Amino acid sequence: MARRVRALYDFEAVEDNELTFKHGELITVLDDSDANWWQGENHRGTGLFPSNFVTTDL
C-alpha cells in the first residue's frame, strides 16, 4: 500500500517531473523503488522528490 510521510523541509520542483511541497505537509509515497528519489502525491499533484526530505513520523 502507498504509505504516508511528512515533509521535513520545503522543496520546490525545478523539473516538470518533480513534486512541490512545504515543511509539515503530508506526502503519499507512490513509488520508493529508487533510494534517493521517490514518487509522491499531495494536494498539488504528483512527482519525484528527495527521500531525505521526509520522515515516517506523522
Partner: peptide, 9 residues
C-alpha cells in the same frame, strides 16, 4: 535543508 543532487534522479 539537505543538499539536493539531480544528477542521480
Amino acid at each position: 535543508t539537505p543538499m539536493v543532487n539531480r544528477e542521480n534522479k
